[PDB]
Amino acid sequence: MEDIKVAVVGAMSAGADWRISKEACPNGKTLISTLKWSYTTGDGKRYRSTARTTFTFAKPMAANYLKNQPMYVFRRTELKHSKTEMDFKEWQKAFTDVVGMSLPATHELHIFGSINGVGFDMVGQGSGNPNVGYEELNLKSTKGELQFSPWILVPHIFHQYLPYPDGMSPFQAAMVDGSGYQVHRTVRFEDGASLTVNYRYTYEGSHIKGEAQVKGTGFPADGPVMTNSLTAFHIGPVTQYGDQEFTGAEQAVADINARGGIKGNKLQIVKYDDACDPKQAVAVANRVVNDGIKYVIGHLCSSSAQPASDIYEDAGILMITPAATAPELTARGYQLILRTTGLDSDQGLTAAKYILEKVKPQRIAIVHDKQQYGEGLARAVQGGLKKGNANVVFFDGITAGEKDFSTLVARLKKENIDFVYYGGYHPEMGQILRQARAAGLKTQFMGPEGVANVSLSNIAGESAEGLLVTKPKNYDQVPANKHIVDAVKAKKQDPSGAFVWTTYAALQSLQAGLNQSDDPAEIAKYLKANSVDTVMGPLTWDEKGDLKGFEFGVFDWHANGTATD
Ligand SMILES: CC[C@H](C)[C@H](N)C(=O)O
Ligand SMILES: [Cl-]
């Protein structure tokens, strides 16, 4: 009768604005606060850290603070930084429940020590509002240029600026009486690295002097930290796909658990982020196993669902990908691996047919981005086009995430290309469509479900008009799915996305399974020999876990970010 844990594996999700510091006091003279903290890489990767932080009070804390077992503190931050300056702002709000809706005026921070034995030292002034939990800080180097990421000194760059619901925090209480606290903080990194910070404070009226002594060690030398690859989260090349999964998934789970759940037992999503990165997707998978989670919804890109699939199979963990389409993944005899989507093979053949039958252009160019998906899809299509005598002029590739297509654009122009197929994902396609119509090509473009999203429209504007896509059918127009569509809307979320539906269908799949056996093997056996009613229709699977008789369907794309037959 425990809740049943399902892993949902997104990609390049923002995550929550506020961080939970949990706060416990085991004695009158000690406060311990626990932190989870992911950084993000100028790449959209996640570097995961866990903090323990210890406050020593020279005088015992009044009884009121102790009688109020777990306090919860929500904190956000911002950092602008050069190689020499930093500028930082913190908002902090205390509550006694995990549900989110003279005192100090000025301070200084001397923050010094070492990172992988590279000494650093910074100094500078700041202010805050002890009533509201706001603080700000400027900091200048007294040595030279940080040869590490300044986002590693974040959080560590003044809890005397908090307050509790009905008064002063313990931290403030301690400043006003003069007896004070000290702070040890310790950070574990997923990659073995380690950071120690010790904090002493003097008070001079309402001004604070912070001393902060910093020992970091065994950061990998081409890690995010030693490499300055750390950024705030900026939307990433697959944020659209992760967001559509999470949406379809959170609706589904609500709707299931309302209907009473599996057999009394409710489902609980445990969110993970693999960044569609091979290594990270392998960190995620090892964590999934270790967390006792036996059913996985996700790994969205082929490139990251392969590496992940190995561990899951190796561990007796069920994995339904609602999104990864490269046929490789179900072509290696794995038994615990299912799909709520089709394959590049059928997706490239659908295209070629629509080009040979219903377009018939004169001069074809085939472009891809060189990854499994894109090249994969271009080879189907090329092969379909070759067999129907279509006049394919050149097949070519580009790097993912360059913004400059002046070379491809001048070349489609020089060679009077009226049609182009682009195997790949929306960022590159977006720029193509847009830098094309800028240069005044009348060229007609085509893409797979990877470009069939609202972000394509966001990048391209009017250029997106007339783009041809292959994509799953529009199940958001099917009357059964009306209720679901309304709920997504109630939440201001966009239900047209296909991964919303595939994801929703993948949970329903898991549902049917779970209703006999909590065992990952019988589920895969059951599902393979039975049809499930889902938001996509009935869903028979085959013995390698591919959906039987899945047809993508070909659609006209529009600058509004909808799509018609
Ligand atoms: C999110 C899925 C992406 C677009 C594609 N189907 C792939 O296998 O990489
Ligand atoms: Cl803290």
Swiss-Prot record:
Subcellular location, record wording: Periplasm
Name the record gives this protein: Leu/Ile/Val-binding protein
Function: This protein is a component of the leucine, isoleucine, valine, (threonine) transport system, which is one of the two periplasmic binding protein-dependent transport systems of the high-affinity transport of the branched-chain amino acids.
GO cellular component: periplasmic space
A GO BP entry: amino acid transport
Major place of residence: periplasm
Highest taxon in the source lineage: Bacteria
Keywords, alphabetical: Amino-acid transport, Disulfide bond, Periplasm, Signal, Transport
Protein family per UniProt: Belongs to the leucine-binding protein family.
Cysteines engaged in disulfide bonds, as pairs: 276-301
Transmembrane portions of the chain: none
Pfam families attached to this UniProt entry: Peripla_BP_6
